């Protein structure tokens, strides 16, 4: 049991890409941007509660932010956590 207030903060956005699209069509895996301090257990709990789908497993990685220049002034985008959430077979988001 994680508190719902916590679960309502952990999922930030669906990650849109060719790889994410292929993940959903081939492997029944949604790709999410999640809070940087989100654990696999919290992401699982949140997806099952909020999307109302059975989660099989969560795989996670931290995307390191890119160094970029805006008018010859150097900056760095933020690191963010990606979750590959594999839904149980036949759940279908």
């Amino acid at each position: 049991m994680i508190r719902e207030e916590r679960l309502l903060k952990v999922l930030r956005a669906p990650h849109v890409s060719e790889k994410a699209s292929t993940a959903m069509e081939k492997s029944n895996t949604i790709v999410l941007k999640v809070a940087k301090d989100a654990t696999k257990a919290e992401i699982k709990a949140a997806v099952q509660k909020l999307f109302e789908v059975e989660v099989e497993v969560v795989n996670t990685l931290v995307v390191k932010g890119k160094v970029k220049r805006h008018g010859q002034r150097i900056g760095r985008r933020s690191d963010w956590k990606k979750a590959y959430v594999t839904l149980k077979e036949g759940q279908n988001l």
């Binding site: 994680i2 508190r3 207030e5 916590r6 679960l7 903060k9 952990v10 301090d37 654990t39 919290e42």
Partner: peptide, 6 residues
């Protein structure tokens, strides 16, 4: 989980 403040 939330130690940040929740």
């Amino acid at each position: 989980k939330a130690x940040r403040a929740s």
